[PDB]
Amino acid sequence: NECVSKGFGCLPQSDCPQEARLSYGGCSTVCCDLSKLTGCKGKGGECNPLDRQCKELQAESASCGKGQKCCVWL
């Protein structure tokens, strides 16, 4: 679709802030400029408890809040 062909990707509205939204077509969610995303989920991570063994994205762990860290599953 136009979104992907232009170099971007579809994301749920709740995962794409207004400032990162694009008008490109083909998504039944919204086209997102993924280069403008910040935080754990935006960088392909998942917030997990500190005791979970994982590959941490330390720069995004603060977005997960107390007792949590950002893990990226490969």
């Binding site: 992907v4 990707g9 579809c10 969610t29 063994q53 590959k55 599953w73 490969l74």
Partner: protein, 301 residues
Amino acid sequence: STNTFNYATYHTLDEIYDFMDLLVAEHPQLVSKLQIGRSYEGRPIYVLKFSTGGSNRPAIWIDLGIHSREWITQATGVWFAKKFTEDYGQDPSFTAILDSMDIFLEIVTNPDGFAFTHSQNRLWRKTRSVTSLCVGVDANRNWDAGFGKAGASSSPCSETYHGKYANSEVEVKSIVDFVKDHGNFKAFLSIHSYSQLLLYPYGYTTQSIPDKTELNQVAKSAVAALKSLYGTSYKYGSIITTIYQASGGSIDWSYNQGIKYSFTFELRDTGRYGFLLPASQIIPTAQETWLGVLTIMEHTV
């Protein structure tokens, strides 16, 4: 034709499936298309068999795209498929491999997830099975090797959710049935991204595999071959010591079935783009990865 196919761009499920049909039509003596099952959402699951004939030839399994967002893997799978038809009869080492062995290539192991990454959620990892208001299972936590043990999540909303029971996901059960019923796989290579790693078992336990010395040496050699093309640096080791404890995983299961040469690749890059690797790196990634895969195949033969 597959000569005019654009290997330097990301494609849809349907485009990859059409590519399979074209490749088979062009090389009917070398490649055939098998359906190993039907996805949760009713899509055919396809494996390409590369073979020059024979009976019960030792086999190499390669799965790509088990985790849908890892787009570099499906793209590499398409390139591999073409490469096999190009180099058979030319490269003496690869010709010798296909004259003694069959290769089974699954380009899109999680087709429902793949479609979903294109139309709704680019960062979707899991299958799309439902029951819950949360969706999908981590298909690389669903295998019968430490299933449900530490290294996966029991929460259905989790990205590493193991599922209801081992092989609950038809995408996994289909491979399991196929490989067990075949009965003579000698290598099993699971292709993921990212991090630039070559991993051997185990993920689910700190116990070292009996074949650790050999697989570690094979990994070292394959990593050196990969690096020779563009200088791309890979590390290697067991899953649990290199990334994290992971249970219900594909190569842990395959190794436990007696498939010795069981490895998981983590392709480019190391975090700059992560899963969102630019299409301009598809070809260079696939080329270098092929050198690593060929090194493993050569040791198998």
